[PDB]
Every structure is written in C-alpha cells, then in structure tokens.
Amino acid sequence: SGFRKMAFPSGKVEGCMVQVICGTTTLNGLWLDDVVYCPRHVICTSEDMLNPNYEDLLIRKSNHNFLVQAGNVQLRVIGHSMQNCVLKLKVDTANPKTPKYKFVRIQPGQTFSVLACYNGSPSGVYQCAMRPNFTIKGSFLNGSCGSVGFNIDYDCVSFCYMHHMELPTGVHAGTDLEGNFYGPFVDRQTAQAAGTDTTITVNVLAWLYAAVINGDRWFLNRFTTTLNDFNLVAMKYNYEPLTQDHVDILGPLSAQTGIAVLDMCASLKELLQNGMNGRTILGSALLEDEFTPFDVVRQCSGVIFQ
Amino acid sequence: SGFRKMAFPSGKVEGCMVQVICGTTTLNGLWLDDVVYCPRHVICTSEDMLNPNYEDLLIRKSNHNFLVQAGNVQLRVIGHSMQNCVLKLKVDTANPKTPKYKFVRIQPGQTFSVLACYNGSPSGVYQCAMRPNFTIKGSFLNGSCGSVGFNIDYDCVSFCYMHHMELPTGVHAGTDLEGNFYGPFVDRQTAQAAGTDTTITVNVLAWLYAAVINGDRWFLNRFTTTLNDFNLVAMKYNYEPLTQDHVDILGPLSAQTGIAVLDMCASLKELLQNGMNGRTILGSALLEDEFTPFDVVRQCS
C-alpha cells in the first residue's frame, strides 16, 4: 500500500562512522574491524590539492598525525597505508559493531543508500542512483567527505561508495571502498567535467510499472512498439537504449501487471513525444529514473497469474 | 550543495524494534525501557476488526497470550495495559539500547522519518509530512502495523507516530505514542473519509529559499506583495493561509538569502499564476510542500 523512495535502515553503518583528523583537515571515516577507511585527500591542505603527490605527502605523515574519534573515545592509529584514493588507518581497537560486510562496485543505473555524516556523526539518509555519467545527485556539505553508500542484503552490508568531492555542476563524485573512482575523476583540484547524462530507461519503465500497481493508468494505450523502433525514440530523448537483459529484468513486473514490456515502451514513447499534458504519474510532473526494477518489486510485491 | 529529501539516521529506533504477537496476529512494537508499545488491535484477528470491543477483548486476554520477541532473544510479559488506542505491555528485561527519547504530537505541516518494519524487522527509512487533512503519503505493506515515525534532535529521539491501519481508500492512518489517532480515524476496518487537503504554504516558501541557496533563482522577481493580497491568491489554488506566525519562522531563511518573506510570496504568486513553462526548480517540475523551514535550514546550514 503506497510507493515511496526509501533508503535502507542505516543502523549498521552508523556504528562504523568515525571522525578522522589530519592536521587542519577533518572528515569522516568507516571503522570496519581494526581498519578505518577514509578519503586520502585528508592528508593534504588546500595548497597541496593543486597537484598533490599523495605518496610523498604520505611519507611525511606518521601514526601520531592521525586523530580518530569514535564519539567521545579516541582510537590509537598503529599503522597507515594507501590503496588507490582511500587511506587505510590501522587502529588498535577492533570495532565491536562491525557488521557482516563486503566491498562491492555497483554499476550505473543501480541504487544505494547514502548516510551523510559531519565530524563522524550521522546526519541523514537518502536513496541515490549511480548516474550513467558516474556521478550522484546528492546532498553533501563541508565535512561530508568519507560519507558512505551501501545496500543491505539480508544480514550483509555491501559498501559501494565513499564521497570524495563535488563537481562544478553540483553533482558528487567518489570511489568504491577500494579507492577506485567512479568515472573519469581524480582527487586533484583541476577543472573536471562530469560528462553527458543519459536517462536510465530500465528504471523509468520500472517506475511506470510501480505507477500502474498503485492505480495510475491514463498513460496506458492500445498501441505497441518494437525494441528497435523504441531505441530510435530513446536516441532523440537522451534515454539509454534498452538491452535484452534489461527487458528480462522487467519480466516479474510485466508478469504481475499483465502489461507487456513493449506496451510499457509504447506508453513511454508517447509520454516523450506528447508529454504528460498536465497529468501526473505518482504525483510527479516528470518521469522518474532513480528506482531500479528491484526497488519497485521490493514495495510493489504482488502475485503473478501464470 | 544539492537538496535531497533526507530521513533521520534510524539506528536509535532499530534497537527499539521488536515483534509483538497476540493470538494469530503479528505486528511490530516499540521497546523503550521495560514497556513495549504497539497498536491495540494486536489482540484482534482477521475476523474481529470489523467493529470490535477493545475493552472486553483486553479482559479476555492474559500475559500468556502475548509473546514479545526481540530477535533471537525472547521477552516475557509482566503486565498488559491500554492507553487510548495503544497497547502497553510491561516486560522483565529493560531495553539496553533505549536512547534518550520523548513523546510528542506533531502538528499538520510538520515532518518526520518513518522506519517501515515487517515482523519486528526494519525494512526501510523514508521522510513523511503530516498532511493538513491528517493523512501521510506512506508506503506500508502487511505486517507493518506498529512501525513508528520520529524526529531526531541531537541524541533525543522524538517519537510522534505509530502506524495502525491502511485505509481501504488507500491512505494510511496512525496515532501519536499516547494512542490518540491523527485526524478523524478509528481502529476499525471500514471506508473512512480522509478530508480536504490544502497545500502547506510555509513549506513551499521554505523550499523556494532552498532553491535560491542552491543556485536556482530564475523564479525571483523585483515585485512585492502584502499578506491580504497573497492570502487572496492562496484561496484560489488550494494553498494554506499564511499567518503572522508563518512569517516569523521564515526569518533566518530570508536573512541567509537577502529575499524578504513578502518578496518570495510575490514569486510564488507568479509561479502559481503562469506556471513554469518548461523550467524546473531544484529538479522538480512541481512546487514542493513536504519540507518544513527547519528541514531546509537543516540541510542548507
């Protein structure tokens, strides 16, 4: 009953948030076992960031230079090392709250929850999607660096994102928890451009299935379309071309609603050319692409008449 | 930068979530200290909730019927009770993960985070607004009865909502943590009239400031207007009348941007009158009333 953009419960991730201080720089860290993971730019100063030699700057830093706070308790840094763009600080105490975890690399189109933190304190949680241009449309401010993205699958927390920087366009950039950036970005103060952002069509189709499940059918029409002649409209409107694996992923939602995938593609084609003409789908005046088919199934779980 | 609908970190509330069972009925409970709060219809089954007598059903039940579970560990009931529409079950074990909390009753227009739960297990966290007609734009499935709505102030979790019934008409009904329903709803499964829904004007004007702070300012005009003139336009589009108390709250937002309260009213008046004609504000092609001035300040400060 109802459809909302929902984040995963953040509890398991809050128990891991710590504050990391290095000289004049303060950001957030993720305490898993006796290792703290944080953006490696923490070892820099604004001047360093113009062209930082992270290897040379990491030589000059010692275990004493890193101040880690888990609430009011201080943690002893007994070792340090760098892995791509992430700094790994080995602490003396293991985090008793370390959940069952794994470092995963999500694909563009996929969603995750973000826990925004300031000075090692959780502030809020929101659901995000990895845009096809490898940026996120988030809400982060000074001190948010080190804030993580994650999904929860049963008892396991899959960490997939760590916030590093904001791009001139207002969008955000970061790495997986192995330090590897998503997209063509670098942790260096240089002119950077996000790229062209296409709309995630598989997600838009999923959202239209969620709208039908919640009683919105004005957009449904007698017309049908082919996969090939839909991708032609998708080229004009900057929508991703629909692959066969994506059509199959929409199988369960198609089977439930009894609307064939290409009949939903015809409705999508019509909304692109003619527009919504004042009407709203799920109370939104625009087509939403930030819900994966799995997110729709998670809330719009219904029966299938085979 | 960027403006997102954010929910409060739900960790302090996840530690309070237990699975409450009574008869062949299973919902969620909120375990705070040695008391577990849950919707009183936990005593009822799929055949009692048409029009039941909750007073005579509470007499018929003893502490052996109620089985409170906190995950792997089981809780034993040491005294059932009832305040308004909520059921308070006393327990032997006090909740070790009980955070500093308070029970509040939110007013229409105010927001809170909902932690959705199924069989005592948390599923997702989303931010809701209490509509003027006392309804919530929620997402709840079966077994979500007893899911709570809250606000987090530093360490203090203010619990303001408990999910009771999903109306046949669609919308969701619930009480405060004292058991008093929000609006004209009862714990009986029947078609109940939600009411007339106005747009929360104070929340739209706060959202217009959030857009200005985040670089969106095409909607801004040189023009200005008085309360009496704006309140006339407010009636035409189903918008809440702007009170003088509504003006005082928007002060810090106005100070941060430079645009005075009455100046932003003149932009809203024009946006309602002409529309947007292709353009969007904060990535939305519609005006947003789900963000209080405090929610906008929370993110943009």
Q: Which residues, at least 6 apart from B210, have a Cβ–Cβ distance to it below 8 Å?
A: B3, B282, B291, B296, B299, B300
Residues of B in contact with A124 (CB under 8 A): 6-9, 298-299
Give A306: exposed, middle or buried? Use CB within 10 Å, 0-12, 13-18, 19+.
exposed
Cβ separation A170–B215 shorter than 8 A: yes
| DSSP assigned state of A50 | G
Q: Determine contact, residues B40/B23, Cβ cutoff 8 Å.
A: no
> Residue written as tokens 């918008």?
B239
The resolution, in Å, is 2.3
If phi > 0 it is left, if psi is from -120 to 50 it is alpha, else beta; for residue B191 that is beta
Which CATH topology does A201-299 take? main proteinase (3clpro) structure, domain 3 (1.10.1840)
- 3-state secondary structure at position A201: helix
Which of B45-84 are b and which e, b meaning 16 or more Cβ less than 10 Å from the residue's Cβ? eeebeeebebeebeeeeeeeebbbbbeeeebebeebebee
Cβ separation B2–A171 shorter than 8 A: yes
Cβ separation A10–B15 shorter than 8 A: no
| Identity of the residue numbered A211 | A
* B170–A contact, CB cutoff 8 A: yes
User: How far is it, in rounded angstroms, from Cα A306 to Cα B86?
Assistant: 42
Label the pairing between strands A156-166 and A100-103.
Answer: parallel
> Which residue, among A126, A213, A271, A277, would best test binding to B if mutated, counting the most B CBs under 10 Å from its CB?
A126
Residues of B in contact with A139 (CB under 8 A): 1-4, 6, 299
What's the number of CA atoms in the CB half-sphere (13 Å) around residue B133? 15
Q: Determine contact, residues A194/A133, Cβ cutoff 8 Å.
A: yes
Instruction: Please pick, among A85, A117, A145, A265, the residue that the annotation labels catalytic.
Output: A145
- 3-state secondary structure at position A174: strand
Instruction: Please pick, among A16, A22, A38, A41, the residue that the annotation labels catalytic.
Output: A41
- DSSP per residue, A218-279: TT--S----HHHHHHHHHHTTB----HHHHHHTHHHHHHHT--HHHHHHHHHHHHHT--TT-
- 3-state secondary structure at position A74: strand
- Measured CA angle at A265 (ends A264, A268), to 5 deg: 90
Residues for chain A: how many in total? 306
> How far is residue B217 from each of residues A77, B62, B266, measured CA to CA in Å?
47, 62, 13
User: How far is it, in rounded angstroms, from Cα A12 to Cα A18?
Assistant: 13
Q: Which residues, at least 6 apart from B250, have a Cβ–Cβ distance to it below 8 Å?
A: B202, B205, B206, B209, B261, B264, B293
- DSSP per residue, A82-150: EETTEEEEEESS--TT--EEEE--PPTT-EEEEEEEETTEEEEEEEEE--TTS-B-----TT-TT-EEE
The two three-digit tokens of residue A241, written as one number: 């071309």
| DSSP assigned state of A79 | E
Long-range contacts at A182-187 (CB < 8 A, ≥ 24 apart): A182/A130, A182/A134, A182/A135, A183/A133, A183/A134, A183/A135, A184/A134, A185/A134, A187/A39, A187/A40, A187/A41, A187/A52, A187/A54, A187/A85
Q: Sign of the C-alpha dihedral, residues B279, B283, B287, B293?
A: negative
User: How far is it, in rounded angstroms, from Cα B28 to Cα B163?
Assistant: 9
Which of A91-101 are b and which e, b meaning 16 or more Cβ less than 10 Å from the residue's Cβ? beeebebbbeb
Cβ separation B214–A9 shorter than 8 A: no
What chain B residue is nearest to A166 in terms of C-alpha separation? Answer: B1
Q: How far is A14 from chain B (nearest CA, A)?
A: 7
| Identity of the residue numbered B217 | R
Residues of B in contact with A283 (CB under 8 A): 137, 286
For residue B68, the cross-strand partners are B20, B75
Start-to-end CA distance of chain B, whole Å, equals 10
Q: Determine contact, residues A124/B9, Cβ cutoff 8 Å.
A: yes
Domains A11-175 and A201-299 share a fold: no
User: How far is it, in rounded angstroms, from Cα A101 to Cα A149?
Assistant: 13
Cβ separation A125–B286 shorter than 8 A: no
User: How far is it, in rounded angstroms, from Cα A45 to Cα A60?
Assistant: 13
Residues of B in contact with A28 (CB under 8 A): none
* B196–A contact, CB cutoff 8 A: no
User: How far is it, in rounded angstroms, from Cα B43 to Cα B58?
Assistant: 7
Q: Determine contact, residues A204/A211, Cβ cutoff 8 Å.
A: no
Of A7, A138, A284, the CB nearest to B124: A7
Domain regions of chain B by residue span: 11-175, 201-299
Cβ separation B139–A301 shorter than 8 A: no
The two three-digit tokens of residue B151, written as one number: 């606000």
Q: Determine contact, residues B264/B254, Cβ cutoff 8 Å.
A: yes
Residues of A in contact with B298 (CB under 8 A): 124
The two three-digit tokens of residue B205, written as one number: 């004007």
Give B100: exposed, middle or buried? Use CB within 10 Å, 0-12, 13-18, 19+.
exposed
| Identity of the residue numbered A84 | N
Q: Which residues, at least 6 apart from B171, have a Cβ–Cβ distance to it below 8 Å?
A: B135, B136, B138, B194
Q: What is the 3-state secondary structure (H, E, C) of chain B?
A: CCCCCCECCCHHHHCCEEEEEECCEEEEEEEECCEEEEEHHHCCCCCCCCCCCHHHHHHHCCCCCEEEEECCEEECEEEEEEECCEEEEEECCCCCCCCCEEECCCCCCCEEEEEEEECCEEEEEEEEEECCCCCECCCCCCCCCCCEEEEEECCEEEEEEEEEEECCCCCEEEECCCCCECCCCCCCCCCCCCCCCCECHHHHHHHHHHHHHCCCCCCCCCCCCCHHHHHHHHHHCCECCCCHHHHHHCHHHHHHHCCCHHHHHHHHHHHHHHCCCCCCECCECCCCCCCCHHHHHHHCC
Closest CA to A200 of A234, A174, A226: A234
- Other residues' Cβ atoms within 10 Å of the Cβ of residue B173: 23
Cβ separation B9–A123 shorter than 8 A: yes
Phi first, then psi: what are they for B210, rounded to 5°?
-55, -40
Which of B122-144 are b and which e, b meaning 16 or more Cβ less than 10 Å from the residue's Cβ? bbbbbbbbbbbbbbbbbbbeebb
| Identity of the residue numbered B39 | P
CATH superfamily of B11-175: Trypsin-like serine proteases (2.40.10.10)
Q: Determine contact, residues A112/A151, Cβ cutoff 8 Å.
A: yes
User: How far is it, in rounded angstroms, from Cα A89 to Cα A54?
Assistant: 15
User: How far is it, in rounded angstroms, from Cα B54 to Cα B82?
Assistant: 9
Of A12, A126, A166, the CB nearest to B7: A126
Q: What is the CA radius of gyration of chain B?
A: 22
Closest CA to B129 of B301, B296, B11, B300: B296
Q: Determine contact, residues A11/A20, Cβ cutoff 8 Å.
A: no
Has A145 been annotated as catalytic?
yes
Calculate the CA A87 to chain-centre distance: 21
User: How far is it, in rounded angstroms, from Cα B21 to Cα B67?
Assistant: 5
Q: Sign of the C-alpha dihedral, residues B206, B207, B211, B214?
A: positive
Q: With the CA atoms of B250, B256, B259 and B262 taken in that order, what torsion angle do they form, in degrees rounded to the nearest 10?
A: 10
For residue B83, the cross-strand partners are B86
Cβ separation A170–B125 shorter than 8 A: no
Residues of B in contact with A170 (CB under 8 A): 1-2, 214-215
Residues of B in contact with A17 (CB under 8 A): none
> Which residue, among B3, B13, B126, B172, would best test binding to A if mutated, counting the most A CBs under 10 Å from its CB?
B126
Of A1, A141, A284, the CB nearest to B140: A1
> Residue written as tokens 């809203």?
B268
Q: Which residues, at least 6 apart from B89, have a Cβ–Cβ distance to it below 8 Å?
A: B20, B29, B35, B36, B38, B66, B68, B77, B79, B80, B81
Long-range contacts at B215-219 (CB < 8 A, ≥ 24 apart): B215/A170, B215/B1, B216/B281, B216/B282, B218/B279, B219/B267, B219/B270, B219/B271, B219/B276, B219/B281
> Residue written as tokens 């694996």?
A245
| DSSP assigned state of A8 | P
Q: How far is B231 from chain A (nearest CA, A)?
A: 25
